[PDB]
């Protein structure tokens, strides 16, 4: 539901590290551990990230939507109170 900084830090970490490895004299020379145990964590983290991301989007919309209605409410109520007061004025 919410990604932690530790998870987030493993991403730029992994990302960056992947480059320090992009061109090294072997693949196994990297597939020793730190890369593989890191990758493992990062990859698993895709599911939480999305789950977390989706939840943020969803809410936002539910909230955009609510706001919209709220505006329209505080928009009609005025247009109505406006004419209403004008009628009184026109007397």
């Amino acid at each position: 539901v919410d990604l932690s900084d530790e998870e987030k830090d493993s991403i730029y970490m992994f990302a960056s590290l992947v480059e320090k490895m992009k061109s090294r004299p072997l693949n196994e020379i990297l597939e020793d551990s730190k890369l593989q145990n890191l990758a493992q964590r990062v990859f698993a983290s895709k599911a939480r990230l999305n789950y977390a991301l989706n939840d943020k989007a969803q809410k936002y919309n539910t909230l955009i939507e609510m706001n919209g209605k709220i505006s329209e409410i505080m928009n009609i109520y005025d247009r109505l109170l406006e004419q209403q007061l004008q009628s009184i004025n026109l007397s």
Partner: protein, 88 residues
């Protein structure tokens, strides 16, 4: 506390629809008056701030996750490329 607002999810709809029904009748006064409408307004109207706040928050967060996912998206690709040369 976020719930304080997501709860009103229905009062909003309700007040909306009823006020809406009105704006297409010009009965003005009726709806303008009526304690219930006042009541729903009296509880919805004040959510503007909280709602305004929450918008920015989730607005941000969503922005972040997308950027992070983009980064992960790339590293993966790189990883996989580097990995391909590990097949053969």
């Amino acid at each position: 506390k976020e719930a304080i607002v997501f709860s009103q999810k229905t009062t909003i709809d309700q007040l909306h629809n009823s006020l809406n029904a009105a704006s297409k009748t010009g009965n003005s006064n009726e709806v303008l008056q009526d304690p219930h409408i006042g009541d729903m307004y009296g509880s919805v109207t004040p959510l503007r701030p909280q709602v305004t706040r929450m918008l920015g928050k989730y607005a941000k967060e969503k922005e972040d996750m997308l950027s992070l996912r983009q980064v992960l998206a790339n590293a993966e690709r790189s990883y996989n490329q580097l990995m391909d040369r590990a097949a053969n």
